[PDB]
Design a protein around this ligand. Structure first.
Ligand SMILES: Nc1ncnc2c1ncn2[C@@H]1O[C@H](COP(=O)(O)OP(=O)(O)O)[C@@H](O)[C@H]1O
Lengths: 409, 326, 343, 61, 72
């Protein structure tokens, strides 16, 4: 049913479709409904082959990979397939604007994060569309959610939950967010992290918010009467003839359902509270499970190349090593830059293997930190070396000139 | 005077020619050395000596597989820890250990990520307190009024060390994650429920004297976790120092004063060489350079005279090696 | 002379060091001023575009807006003001003898970056309007160089303003348009209907030459002199608004009205311009449209005018009698290239 | 707490029996107290089979 | 040593005889004397007497000089 609804939405908000475009769109919808929860790469490849078999045996067409299907309504007025390079350029310009406007963060854009942006935008454009992002730390979950919500005009509400906090503060911030969604008709993207669920009662409150479209506990008695009076005054201001309690509360529920999207950020899905959060009954059936996982080696190669291509790196001879194709993760080696990127990727994989992470997702924070440190360190070292060599050279030249002048005299 | 100027600079000319000859060799191995230095900086903060050596062997193998050159006699202390920084750290109260020197250089060269200190002995708290003087301030996650004290410290610009790191308080997350909003020439950060200004001279340290504690994944993935664990050579050196102080206090005082004078003389010689190079580059001057060369000869003679007490120290070390190993 | 339409292809291209933010035209001499994200200020001749006439870096951050004015008096030069992110507003002098830029003074007092400035002449007095991220709409006298009025009419930060007589209007980040009387410093009516922040809002001006949106409807609006307003936002739409008649005006118990809503842009609309019955607007879809006010449709589309985004464009002012409405059109883009239309 | 402050000020021995029944107090107040008179000695009686006492408190005693 | 100019920008690329490179951004790309330089993003190739040629690209966004690759 979610696949059918997605196909209808894409057709309704799309251009004149052909049979090939219809098949590709259905395949993209199948990717977004059936194969965002897959963890392993081999299961993704199996699903790709399954789509190929199903399309070939029912609808007798381009490549149907996960990244080769880029459907987005950002580049036009309608939901249609877009190219890769122009989409990357547009996302680069809009992320530069976002970093200028809200918070500065040095992030580098690759193809997989473009795909994640597209699916997060698709899930945030829906009615009753909630997300649940799973992946290793520093993969870029909350910053992507904030950027996509800024693209759609949503208002970011991040709960300020810390230690020495109880259910009172969480209920207060949830009630405030609900009031902003309904009474002030402001669209809200509430981002809930794994660490913001201190106690299982927080998870129960989130479960009640997601299963229904309101918390019955947060409006009881005198505060229920205050909500009734406030929303009656709002409806009088808006200009609708609602008088009964049932119709007015149904309007309240509909406004919350239309103007509230909850995005979950989860770092390690093996922990007990995270496993309970994943296996929650109405969190599973309502949210769109988007398993980002750890960075695959292509993404690490792309971001490493895009962050070391600006430093002065190639300055000496290089012999191309004779290495296997399975040991080369970048393009075939032509300069020392690809060798440096491959060395960093190999050391990251070997370090995470030696530390026995098991099946826990691998944080790419060490990779980015090492890349930035290497860039700044090689810049400083090259500057110091060339300055020292110039100083020694001019000193030797001055000494030789003085010796020659003394010999001539 | 010009003749003596030319004659006295024979050793300087030989050293300059040797450095010019070795410039190609040092430029060939620059990239590999930078790679290993960055790996030390961002990976081996939380590893013991055996794991550091094993992963260094793996890194050297992986670096030689792709045929990029690196220094065969590479060492982290000689490449990142300068003599002035080493002198300051040793004066402030850091141990003589090479492991502690490596971790010290890792901590104070992390200008981007917030360094997390894991020191069971609680010695780095007073080492960093001595390093920054009276402008440092000590807070903790377990005390009331921590939020307003940290906000006032950020507004003023003091250096903050937060104790009890295993009790992380998640309203300083924007301070940990370095997610600032730039407002022209002023930088502001949102802590709690109201934004505060950042003076730009404010540095953050997190200290936790509890090994095998609990570091949240948000905090664990964004800090330079540095472990200060005592090892074999630190125990041997401390045992030798304690037994020599309790055995012959005057001789121990003489040896430590001699070591301090020797390293001060080496630093003065390096600064004198740098000043001579700068003065010759910016070309009266002959008399000044003759005075500098006389000072350098005096320093070299002072080292030659001061190098006559080493065999006694070596004999005492060879005598107390059994006590140290026991 | 007023129904001119630009040709299919550009005549010549202007090369700038980095992305262009604002572009203005000299009313008398055929010379164009180009801003720069690096902070530089350029001045290119319309005929000899190989080298700039004058180029200087008075700011340290990105220039945000500029607008020029030829001074006149009843008893006479060009005044150029530059707004940047470096917390300061710089006023320049353009001498026509040796054609060089001369800095006059700097205006300080904004608490954040400044994004739009306005300059106009009234009773032989020159005033410099300004709006910034500090939520304050400030004005500084050109001669005295001291602040006159300062008010906070929006909850969020103002992005663009425009001045007609003694009245000012402003669009901000909270998708509202506020019309506030400058001498009294009080709001007259609010604006609602947009869902994305305003990028450019400007008054529409009465003409006597039949344009629907440039003619008054009643005698009271004729005495007021202002009836409609055009606003462009990040909603990919251009909306023509309507100003209710106010009662030191007193606000009538206070809402605007969307007379007409345009659409068709594939990205955020950045800058708008008016010339006769045609409305010229740029957007981030590397294209420029041309809308009729009478029909609301677009006649011509300039697809792929710039490689990257298109930031700014302007035409010659036709409502002012002191400025001859030449058929000069020039646009600025993010791809470090300025485009100018000739003949 | 009051008797610990009084015994630090004016002197006197003190013994805390079964500190494992108040582990939160031990982890916060005792840690921050031992972390920072001459005839004042404090004894703590715990159980070997009980919960894990904090290491920074344990090495300080 | 060598004098170079941009194709459509008001920038002069003057190379010193001591190996420094100046734009009127300064960077001593060559330790020894530079023979000649050429221009062609903008790609600038510098040749010196040290049997090493360094190719630098002039980024006009931040008015800095970045090295792409070098030929030895
Ligand atoms: N595509 C990317 N390029 C560069 N850095 C990235 C990228 N994605 C994430 N990061 C790093 O991750 C950090 C933000 O990650 P965040 O969204 O906070 O992770 P989480 O959601 O797990 O807390 C940034 O500091 C940034 O350096």
């Amino acid at each position: 049913t979610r696949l059918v609804r997605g196909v209808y939405t894409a057709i309704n908000t799309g251009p004149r479709q052909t049979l090939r475009s219809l098949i590709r769109l259905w395949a993209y919808e199948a990717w977004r409904i059936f194969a965002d929860r897959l963890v392993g790469v081999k299961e993704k490849n199996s699903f790709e082959q399954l789509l190929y078999e199903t399309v070939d045996k029912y609808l007798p067409l381009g490549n149907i990979s996960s990244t080769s299907l880029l459907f987005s309504g950002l580049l036009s007025l309608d939901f249609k397939e877009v190219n890769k390079t122009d989409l990357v350029n547009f996302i680069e310009e809009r992320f530069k604007t976002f970093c200028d406007e809200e918070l500065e963060v040095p992030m580098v854009i690759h193809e997989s994060m473009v795909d994640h942006i597209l699916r997060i935008d698709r899930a945030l454009k829906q009615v009753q569309g909630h997300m649940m992002l799973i992946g290793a730390s520093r993969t870029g979950k909350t910053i992507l959610t904030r950027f996509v919500a800024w693209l759609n005009g949503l208002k970011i509400v991040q709960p300020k939950i810390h230690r020495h906090s109880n259910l009172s503060d969480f209920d207060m911030i949830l009630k405030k967010a609900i009031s902003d969604c309904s009474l002030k008709e402001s669209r809200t993207c509430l981002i809930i992290d794994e660490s913001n669920i201190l106690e299982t009662a927080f998870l129960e409150r989130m479960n009640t918010l997601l299963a229904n479209a309101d918390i019955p506990d947060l409006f009881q008695g005198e505060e229920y009467d205050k909500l009734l009076n406030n929303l009656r005054n709002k409806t009088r201001s808006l200009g609708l003839l609602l008088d009964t309690e049932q119709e007015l509360y149904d309007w309240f529920v509909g406004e919350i359902a239309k103007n509230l999207h909850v995005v979950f950020t989860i770092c390690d899905p093996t922990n007990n509270k995270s496993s309970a959060m994943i296996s929650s009954p109405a969190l599973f059936n309502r949210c769109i499970i988007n398993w980002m996982g750890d960075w695959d080696t292509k993404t690490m190669s792309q971001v490493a190349n895009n962050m070391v291509d600006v430093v002065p790196m190639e300055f000496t001879d290089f012999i191309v090593p004779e290495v296997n194709k399975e040991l080369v993760f970048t393009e075939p080696i032509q300069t020392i830059r690809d060798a440096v990127v491959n060395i960093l990727i190999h050391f990251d994989r070997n370090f995470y293997q030696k530390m026995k992470v098991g099946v826990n997702p691998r944080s790419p924070g060490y990779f980015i930190d090492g890349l930035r440190a290497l860039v700044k360190l090689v810049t400083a070292k090259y500057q110091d070396l060339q300055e020292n060599q110039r100083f020694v050279n001019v000193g030797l030249e001055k000494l030789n000139e003085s010796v020659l002048k003394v010999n001539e005299l | 005077r010009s003749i003596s100027l030319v004659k006295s600079l024979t050793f300087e000319k030989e050293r300059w020619l040797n450095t010019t000859k070795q410039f190609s060799k040092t430029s060939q191995e620059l990239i590999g050395n930078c790679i290993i230095s960055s790996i030390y900086e961002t990976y081996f903060g939380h590893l013991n000596e055996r794991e550091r050596g094993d992963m260094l062997v793996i890194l050297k193998r992986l670096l030689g597989k792709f045929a990029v050159k690196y220094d065969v006699n590479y060492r982290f202390i000689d490449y990142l820890v300068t003599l002035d920084e080493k002198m300051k750290w040793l004066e402030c109260g850091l141990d003589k250990n090479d492991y502690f020197l490596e971790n010290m250089s890792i901590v104070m060269n992390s200008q981007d990520a917030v360094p997390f200190l894991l020191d069971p002995s609680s010695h780095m708290i007073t080492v960093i307190s001595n390093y920054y003087g009276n402008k440092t301030v000590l807070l903790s996650f377990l005390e009331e009024g921590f939020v307003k004290r940290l906000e006032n410290a950020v507004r003023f610009g003091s250096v903050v060390i937060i104790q009890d790191g295993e009790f992380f308080d998640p309203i300083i997350s924007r301070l940990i994650s370095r997610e600032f909003n730039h407002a022209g020439n002023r930088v502001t950060v949102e802590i709690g429920d109201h934004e505060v200004d950042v003076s730009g001279d404010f540095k953050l340290f997190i200290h936790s004297c509890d090994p095998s504690g609990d570091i949240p994944i948000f905090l664990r993935s964004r800090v330079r976790l540095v472990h200060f664990v005592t090892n074999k050579e630190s125990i041997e050196t401390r045992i030798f120092d304690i037994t020599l102080t309790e055995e012959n206090a005057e001789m121990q005082r003489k040896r430590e004063d001699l070591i301090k004078l020797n390293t001060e003389y080496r630093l003065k010689l390096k600064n004198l060489e740098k000043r001579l190079l700068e003065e010759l580059n910016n070309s009266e001057l002959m008399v000044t350079l003759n005075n500098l060369k006389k000072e350098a000869m005096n320093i070299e003679k002072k080292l030659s005279e001061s190098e006559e007490f080493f065999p006694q120290f070596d004999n005492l070390v060879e005598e107390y090696s059994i006590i140290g190993k026991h | 002379v007023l129904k001119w339409i630009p040709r299919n292809l550009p005549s010549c291209l202007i090369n700038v060091e980095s992305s262009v933010t604002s572009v203005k035209l000299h009313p008398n001499l055929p010379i164009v001023f180009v801003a720069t994200d690096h902070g530089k200020l350029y001045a290119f001749d319309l005929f000899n575009y190989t080298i700039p006439l004058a180029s200087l870096q008075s700011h340290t951050k990105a220039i945000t807006s500029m607008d020029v004015l030829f001074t006149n008096y009843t008893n006479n030069y060009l005044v150029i003001v530059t707004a940047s992110k470096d917390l300061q507003i710089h006023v320049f002098k353009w001498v026509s003898e040796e054609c060089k830029f001369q800095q006059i003074r700097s205006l300080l007092g904004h608490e954040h970056i400044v994004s739009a400035v306005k300059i106009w002449q009234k009773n032989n007095d020159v005033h410099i309007a300004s709006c910034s991220r500090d939520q304050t709409v400030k004005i500084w006298d050109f001669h005295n160089g001291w602040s006159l009025k300062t008010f906070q009419p929006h909850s969020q930060w103002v992005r663009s303003i425009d001045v007609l007589g003694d009245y000012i209007i402003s669009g901000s980040h909270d998708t509202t348009l506020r019309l506030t009387h400058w001498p009294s410093g009080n709001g007259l009516s609010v604006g609602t209907g947009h869902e994305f922040p305003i990028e450019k809002v400007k008054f529409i001006h009465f003409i006597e030459d039949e344009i629907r949106f440039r003619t008054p409807s009643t005698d009271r609006y004729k005495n007021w002199g202002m009836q409609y307003c055009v606003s462009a936002s990040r909603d990919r739409t251009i909306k023509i608004w309507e100003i209710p008649l106010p009662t030191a005006p007193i606000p009538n118990p206070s809402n605007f009205r969307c007379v007409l809503t345009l659409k068709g842009h594939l990205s955020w609309v950045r800058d708008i311009s008016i010339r006769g019955q045609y409305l010229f607007s740029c957007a981030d879809d590397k294209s420029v449209r041309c809308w009729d006010l009478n029909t609301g449709q677009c006649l011509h589309v300039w697809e792929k005018l710039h490689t990257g985004f298109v930031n700014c464009l302007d035409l010659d002012v036709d409502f002012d009698s002191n400025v001859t409405p030449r058929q000069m059109m020039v646009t600025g883009g993010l791809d470090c290239k300025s485009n100018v239309f000739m003949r | 707490q009051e008797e610990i402050s009084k015994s630090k000020i004016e002197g006197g021995w003190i013994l805390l029996q079964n500190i494992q029944m108040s582990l939160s107090w031990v982890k916060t107040y005792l840690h921050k107290h031992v972390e920072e008179h001459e005839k004042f000695k404090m004894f703590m009686t715990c159980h070997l089979t009980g919960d894990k006492l904090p290491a920074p408190l344990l090495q300080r005693t």
